[PDB]
With several copies, the nearest count.
Chain A
Amino acid sequence: LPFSRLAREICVKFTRGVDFNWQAQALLALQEAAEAFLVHLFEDAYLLTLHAGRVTLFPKDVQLARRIRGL
């Protein structure tokens, strides 16, 4: 999806100027980093949920998995 424009609606707010042209490799790297972050966070949260005995995820559990590490 062209979610890139929706992502840039907040950066253009901070820049107060014309949106800069981002390379295709730049968007690819951003998407890969986002996927890596999401998969790492989800795996970490699921580990502690299964430790608690549950099988499904929860907002509290992913919130804890985020807060335990650095912010």
Chain B
Amino acid sequence: DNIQGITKPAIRRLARRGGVKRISGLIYEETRGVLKVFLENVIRDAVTYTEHAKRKTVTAMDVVYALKRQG
């Protein structure tokens, strides 16, 4: 599936950069869910800003403003 694009070794590598040592097998699905929620929020706000600018394409300004709004 598309959501499984974020592969398990990628999550493990990201966790290693985060400083954790041992990772439980249940955390993969939870991390995918958290990433899904965060992406949903950010994409929704960025798309709303892009519709405001009345463009079909999304630009780095839209995403950075969406990030600024998110909190």
Contact = CB atoms under 8 A, between A and B. Distances in A.
Interface string A37-49: 1111111011001
Interface string A2-44: 1101110111001111111111011011100111011111110
A30 B6 contact: no
Contacts of B64: 29
Contacts, number: 143
Interface residues of B, number: 45
Contacts of A28: 60
A17 B47 contact: yes
A49 B34 CA distance: 18
A6 B20 CA distance: 25
